[PDB]
């Protein structure tokens, strides 16, 4: 539904058509992890929620480069899924 654990409790038949397949999951907590050695980020999901395009606009006797809002012309087909990478620590910082 909202978290992965209870998303895995649903059928393909009772999810098809609703639009939940294009949504990203939600976490719950405030702990710390610290990746071990030789770890990999897996299942990463990225979901956009607002789009803007840079162009010229006019406020009052002036023009400036501003980001104007835009509406998506396609449908719920814009979220990335399944991204994987390899974590490592260079000098106390994590690299993806």
């Amino acid at each position: 539904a909202i978290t992965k654990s209870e998303l895995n409790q649903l059928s393909y038949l009772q999810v098809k058509g609703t639009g939940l397949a294009n949504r990203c999951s939600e976490v719950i907590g405030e702990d710390t992890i610290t990746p071990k050695s030789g770890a990999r980020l897996v299942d990463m999901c990225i979901e956009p929620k607002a789009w803007a395009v840079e162009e010229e606009i006019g406020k009052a006797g002036k023009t400036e480069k501003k980001f104007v809002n835009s509406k998506v012309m396609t449908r719920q087909t814009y979220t990335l899924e399944g991204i994987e990478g390899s974590l490592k620590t260079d000098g106390g910082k994590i690299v993806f």
Partner: protein
């Protein structure tokens, strides 16, 4: 019998057709307003209002 500059005097004593002809001028005016607005909207550039 009427000359060309007196043709539209046949409705002088006909209250029923005076309404009709005045309605016709009204319809023509309204149509002109609508069509002029439509034509103007197709050649207007709203990018720079300054």
């Amino acid at each position: 019998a009427l000359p060309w500059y007196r043709v539209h005097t046949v409705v002088l004593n006909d209250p029923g057709r005076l309404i009709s002809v005045h309605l016709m001028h009204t319809a023509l005016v309204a149509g002109w307003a609508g069509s002029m607005a439509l034509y103007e909207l197709a050649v207007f550039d709203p990018s720079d209002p300054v």
